[PDB]
Design an enzyme around this catalytic site. Structure first.
Site, PDB file in Angstrom:
ATOM      1  N   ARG A  73      92.354  81.557  26.191  1.00 16.49           N
ATOM      2  CA  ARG A  73      92.435  80.135  25.874  1.00 16.49           C
ATOM      3  C   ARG A  73      93.251  79.380  26.907  1.00 16.49           C
ATOM      4  O   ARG A  73      93.158  78.144  27.021  1.00 16.49           O
ATOM      5  CB  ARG A  73      93.109  79.973  24.508  1.00 16.49           C
ATOM      6  CG  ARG A  73      93.167  78.562  23.981  1.00 16.49           C
ATOM      7  CD  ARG A  73      93.714  78.547  22.567  1.00 16.49           C
ATOM      8  NE  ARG A  73      93.744  77.175  22.061  1.00 16.49           N
ATOM      9  CZ  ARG A  73      92.979  76.718  21.074  1.00 16.49           C
ATOM     10  NH1 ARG A  73      92.133  77.532  20.446  1.00 16.49           N
ATOM     11  NH2 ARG A  73      93.080  75.442  20.698  1.00 16.49           N
TER      12      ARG A  73
ATOM     13  N   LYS B 269      79.586  76.323  20.386  1.00 21.19           N
ATOM     14  CA  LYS B 269      79.966  77.695  20.732  1.00 21.19           C
ATOM     15  C   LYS B 269      79.759  78.692  19.592  1.00 21.19           C
ATOM     16  O   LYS B 269      79.298  79.812  19.828  1.00 21.19           O
ATOM     17  CB  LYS B 269      81.405  77.750  21.264  1.00 21.19           C
ATOM     18  CG  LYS B 269      81.842  79.131  21.719  1.00 21.19           C
ATOM     19  CD  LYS B 269      83.110  79.087  22.549  1.00 21.19           C
ATOM     20  CE  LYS B 269      84.327  78.748  21.720  1.00 21.19           C
ATOM     21  NZ  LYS B 269      85.529  78.383  22.532  1.00 21.19           N
TER      22      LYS B 269
ATOM     23  N   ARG C  73      81.789  62.682  10.012  1.00 26.28           N
ATOM     24  CA  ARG C  73      81.808  62.966   8.567  1.00 26.28           C
ATOM     25  C   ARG C  73      82.612  61.940   7.764  1.00 26.28           C
ATOM     26  O   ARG C  73      83.772  61.650   8.094  1.00 26.28           O
ATOM     27  CB  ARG C  73      82.368  64.377   8.330  1.00 26.28           C
ATOM     28  CG  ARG C  73      82.381  64.909   6.880  1.00 26.28           C
ATOM     29  CD  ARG C  73      82.939  66.359   6.913  1.00 26.28           C
ATOM     30  NE  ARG C  73      82.864  67.105   5.655  1.00 26.28           N
ATOM     31  CZ  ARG C  73      81.871  67.936   5.336  1.00 26.28           C
ATOM     32  NH1 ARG C  73      80.823  68.082   6.146  1.00 26.28           N
ATOM     33  NH2 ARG C  73      81.913  68.575   4.180  1.00 26.28           N
TER      34      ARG C  73
END
Length: 212
Positions: free
Chosen positions: A88, A14, A122
């Site tokens: 949201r 996004k 990660r």
């Protein structure tokens, strides 16, 4: 003037898609997270409130968030908009519907497993701070640093447990929002597993909707 919302889970691309839209089209990118963080930086009262919630891993309450977003929008009606991060929740979406006619809602539909993979990729070598991403630059030997042979660790925000909880919260919050917009007939969905595969279709979609 365009009245648009963009939606997508963390890791869905996004940020990238919204940045590309802003580069290529004549509109204002209105990011709720950036609005909150700017208030925090300026030390405003809504900034201090925002920090109080954010630091505890909580959403800004709907009533507070809606008052802040609408206040920003009041003085931006001369421009086309891309709202990003608001609404949201369903109460935010319903409140927005009572204030402005929203014509277009873009949703980035990336599979759960793909987003989870991106968000847990990660690994760090603590002493040096070297970063490895098991998708993009994995270590030469699994689980260990290339230069020292020392173990790699994952930061808490990148661990699968943390990521799964984050994605489940996001799904719980936004499933009702997507249903709301789909029923209203304004939801445009773009499905894909790579941002660069999705972007061309978003770019083409917006051609008839807002000036370049």
């Amino acid at each position: 003037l365009l009245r648009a919302v963009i939606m997508g889970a963390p890791g869905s691309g996004k940020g990238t898609v919204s940045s590309r839209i802003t580069t290529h089209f004549e509109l204002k990118h209105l990011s709720s997270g950036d609005l909150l963080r700017d208030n925090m930086l300026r030390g405003t009262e809504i900034g201090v409130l925002a920090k109080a919630f954010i630091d505890q891993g909580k959403l800004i309450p709907d009533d507070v968030m809606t008052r802040l977003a609408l206040h920003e929008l009041k003085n931006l009606t001369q421009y086309s908009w891309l709202l990003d991060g608001f609404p949201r929740t369903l109460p935010q979406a319903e409140a927005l519907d009572r204030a402005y006619q929203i014509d277009t809602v873009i949703n980035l539909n990336v599979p759960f497993e793909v987003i989870k993979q991106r968000l847990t990729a990660r690994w760090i070598h603590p002493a040096s701070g070297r970063v490895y991403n098991i998708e993009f630059n994995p270590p030469k030997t699994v689980g260990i640093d290339d230069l020292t042979g020392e173990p790699l660790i994952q930061r808490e925000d990148d661990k699968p447990e943390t990521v799964i909880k984050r994605l489940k919260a996001y799904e719980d919050q936004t499933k009702p929002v997507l249903e709301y917009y789909q029923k209203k007939g304004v939801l445009e969905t773009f499905s894909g597993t790579e941002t660069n595969k999705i972007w061309p279709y978003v770019y083409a979609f917006l051609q008839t909707k807002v000036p370049q």
